[PDB]
């Protein structure tokens, strides 16, 4: 195997977690004012999203400060050599469901990146499709001049001594729209407010580092049955980003398609190209799929993703994409023989990776919408195309997972089981998964987030416990490919 725990370090005793109750449309206007922290989606907000990045001999981590009454954006640097954690406290505090800080909002992660070219640090945080609106709006004017939230540092900050690793390394908002002497939140990544609408109504900050050390970023517009992915790139020389560019048109029915669709999956810079892989949700509510259908995959030969997009068979893709049929690989719907409207349930279980070796892997899951029907069916699916194969191998001999990773010659399932990290390892282009690592004692974890770098897994975890201020740990797990 070669798989084992290289280090566990405690980052803090007190990160934010929603320990209260789940509200809904009927109760979100009356949240608990007591000790407990109520929430509208999920309880997870710390050790969640793109919140962990290695840089040289450091690991950088983002989290929200624990205490329902605290909620500060935080940035820690861990020196893996000295063992020193040095933390920067930002003024911005979690603003909650539609800007009510009494209702926890699990979408509102702190995405993190460090430029290897100039040592700048970037954070995009606390965002769920916000826009400028008024008292009559869904957001009740709470996001005016603050609907996109970007913090960034001067060149060389990632590398300064611990003493110098302070807020004073981060660039304040001194724009005409500045909210004042403590405002560290930029409304554009371009540094030109002329561009603010291009940064409007976005969610899920995610960063990548190109093979030549360029930072890429993408976020998601829309939801449900009408969405688009938008991506941009860091101009290290001019210390600014480009405007967002679409992968696909939103409102696909107005751009020539038969229906609107949403995307469920991810864009990933993997094996030297910007690529994407997802399941769509069509606005068609009379077909057999209640939610998602299909698997879709494309890649760009352009360094920045600005065109030259191809499907898996190397066929030129219409860009921005309108018709999801151009890049469809297979239909998980084929693996269940229900015909009735809304009978096929595809939501959980999807992810995808491309190995260094160009082995293309997709995991999904499909069940009957109706769990009580006599002829019920549930199946997990691994679809993979080995580097030098014609077609996909598609198997139900698979127990399912929420994520898939790759390092060196191999693919991995990494997750929690009864509170303890496990690794499953298989050769790229195979379905031969084996458990090769299982932690079996010590404090247990509630949740976390994985980043793969240097043939290791950085597992950024929140420890199990009661209340809204809980410890964060970082595990470095060698994956045995190195
Ligand atoms: Ca600002
Ligand atoms: Ca449907």
UniProtKB/Swiss-Prot annotation:
Q: How does it sit in the membrane?
A: Lipid-anchor
This protein's UniProt keywords: Calcium, Cell membrane, Lipoprotein, Lyase, Membrane, Metal-binding, Palmitate, Secreted, Signal
What, per the annotation, is the impact of changing residue 204 to F? Greatly reduces catalytic activity
Localization, UniProt: Secreted; Cell membrane
Q: Name one GO cellular component term.
A: extracellular region
| One matching Pfam family | BNR_4
- Binding-site residues for substrate, renumbered to this chain: 106-107, 264, 281, 345
Annotated positions binding Ca(2+) 2: 284, 287, 289
Task: Write the protein's name.
Answer: Ulvan lyase, short isoform
> Source species, please?
Alteromonas sp. (strain LOR)
